[PDB]
Design a protein around this ligand. Structure first.
Ligand SMILES: N#Cc1ccc(-c2cc(=O)c3ccccc3o2)cc1
Ligand SMILES: [Zn+2]
Lengths: 47, 161
């Protein structure tokens, strides 16, 4: 795994082109996330 | 160590998690290539993941980050899609769950858009799609995402396409 940038605990990827996209995030230590909900689903075919 | 507790669709907790899932679907620039073509999901089950050792590992690290950032963990709830979801729920996130070729380097990636994490459920780029039909747009097969508690602390802001 890489290291976070010095002085930081994660990276935020801010969208700068697609005005409808929300942010994405990266952590570099497994201990900084807890998998709280497991969601089972299907994608639905548009009508 | 992990136990899974089913939530009822009547539970406010089920409903609030479902709403975050459905309301953060967007269209993707690949026209659906990786994750399929859809505007919404059929939610089949929501389970709470309970593991005391994994929880205490998370809270230990959260307190460390918090103390390095004016008592602010900067904790978010974010989606994660992965072929390794069974390993993650039993053993926790580690270096084996990293996106080695991600655009912000080799770490563990999370999304605000549920539909972004959906693109990784069958692998990077959607892999070859579902195991049964080899269809990245399968409407039959059951998929799983994690909705995760994530400590960001002081986050490096990268503007990007
Ligand atoms: N192997 C492997 C692997 C690679 C990537 C992901 C993953 C999972 C995600 O939910 C995600 C979200 C935003 C951007 C990238 C993302 O990548 C999950 C597993
Ligand atoms: Zn299928």
């Amino acid at each position: 795994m890489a290291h976070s940038p010095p002085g930081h605990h994660s990276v935020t990827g801010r969208p700068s082109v697609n005005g409808l996209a929300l942010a994405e995030y990266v952590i570099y230590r497994g201990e900084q996330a807890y998998p709280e909900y497991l969601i089972t689903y299907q994608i639905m075919r548009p009508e | 160590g992990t136990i899974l507790i089913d939530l009822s669709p009547d539970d406010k907790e089920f409903q609030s998690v479902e709403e975050e899932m459905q309301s953060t679907v967007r269209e993707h620039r690949d026209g659906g290539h990786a994750g399929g073509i859809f505007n919404r999901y059929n939610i089949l089950k929501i389970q709470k993941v309970c593991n005391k050792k994994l929880w205490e590992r998370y809270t230990h690290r959260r307190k460390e980050v918090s103390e390095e950032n004016h008592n602010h963990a900067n904790e978010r709830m974010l989606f994660h899609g992965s072929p390794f979801v069974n390993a993650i729920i039993h053993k926790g996130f580690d270096e084996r769950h990293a996106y080695i070729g991600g655009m912000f380097g080799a770490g563990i990636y999370f999304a605000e858009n549920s539909s972004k994490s959906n693109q990784y459920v069958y692998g990077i780029g959607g892999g070859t799609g579902c195991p049964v039909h080899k269809d990245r747009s399968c409407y039959i097969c059951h998929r799983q995402l994690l909705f995760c508690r994530v400590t960001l602390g002081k986050s490096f802001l990268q503007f990007s396409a």
